[PDB]
Amino acid sequence: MVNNINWVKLPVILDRLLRHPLLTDLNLETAIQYTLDFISAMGLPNVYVDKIETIDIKEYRGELPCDLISINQVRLHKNGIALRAMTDNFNAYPTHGEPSFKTQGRVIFTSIKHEKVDISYKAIMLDDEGLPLIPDNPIFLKTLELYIKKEWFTILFDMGKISPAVLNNTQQEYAFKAGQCNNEFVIPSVSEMEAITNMWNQLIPRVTEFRRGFKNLGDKEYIRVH
Template identity: 25%
Template sequence: MITKLTSIKTVIAKIIADLDLKEDDMRISDIRSWCGEAIEKIGAFTQFIPKVSGQDGTPITKLCGYQASLPCDLHQLHQVAYSFNCDGPWFPMRKATGSFAVWGHGKCCCNCDCYDELGHKKECRHNNCCEHCDPNMIVQEDTMVNLVVDMIGNIDKTEALELLNTNQNLRTIISNLINERTYNDGFNTANPSGGLQYSIKPGFIMCNVPSGYLKLSYSAIPTDEDGYTLIPDLTSYTEAIYWYVTMKLKYPEYLNGKLNREVYYDIRRSWNFYRNQAYAEALMPNEDGMESIKNNWNKIVPEFRDHNTFYSHTGERQIIYNANERY
């Protein structure tokens, strides 16, 4: 289990000391690149830091013209949620599977750049242009009033309107529910009943809704203040990266016949050994993690709708009353 991170500067210092490198022989740029390669080849997902757009200083992802730019530090995308408001509520999206799942023209519907690359609103040169991109504009007041009357009952439209005006939380929920149904029915021309979907093209995420906000759950490679990669503070990681860089440094000597084959193969075996050890150590759960795994594996009834709750209840203990009762 990974609990702390350290900079690859410690690995670089170990390489310089153990290989007795001189200052003129230090290939810092190459070593940094090889350290990144070693981390990628170890491949444990816990070695990356989890990030969510819109939280902890990460900019919210603004969707405009059916598409949005992916974060520059994104390593692997895990899950995507959609909302008509920047503060939710959020609806789960799924990866598009249709053969014609390509949407939009990639431009703002009012032909102006309302938001910058980080999703921050810019000063607009066109009058009311951003109102045409605002997904909340499609909800009419009388539609929400009628829905509140049907939901609560025993109230007239005047009371329903007063309730909407005094309860902002209720207005937001009603507006988003109507928006979700309107978008699913009206904009998804490739698959009208497919729900909220997205697809990925290099650098961009494409959605079947023209505008709104996206919350991206993804993994990023951590770096320190100088841009050096942070690695797990585990001896196995330090040794694995050290032997990988050593293997890269010694390969030209082996290729030119200046290094004995057995010596080079011993370096390769050391890299493979510590790589496997680092991978296993990074994925080893603690007692709390094993409890969630136990609860997930010991369920009588499979839970097929975990995606709707963003898998937040997957590790909970399942309680079913009268499970053995026969009908």
């Protein structure tokens, strides 16, 4: 992402929607739900807050933080060696290796019995209220506004209170801005294309960046003169 994510409260999206006199029955409560549907459906990893927590595994199980949304990596605390993924069907089960993890709910399922693990994860940024906080990006803000205008107009079109030409314009305009908003958040900055440059140009290919926290991923590869 080229621009920085400056945070603003959710009611800044309601100044923009209630400029439209057909969207004047909108609420904070409706703006809360349609934001989280929009934040999810875009899947932009720049909208989330990166956190790291150390949890302790009791017997192939550990309790996961409350704010966790997606795990970046799980690693061991004493080694720093990262855990990949549990493909075993019979993991902590005895009959009569490379460590792994698996997460379903608020429980993580590891391959190690009694160990502390660091979990680097993503959460949602909150307010003084326990409410979501959105980027002030006028591309993000415009297409979140067009998201809610397209969900409200879809209800109104089912009711028969909106022209099919009106909904077709809103469905088209949200469809353009959703790609512009995707490209706004995905396309790297100059400082991220340098780390992409160093990963791409490697005379001796570095193929074990998952073992670290992808720390040396964008590091530059140097060759001695001889």
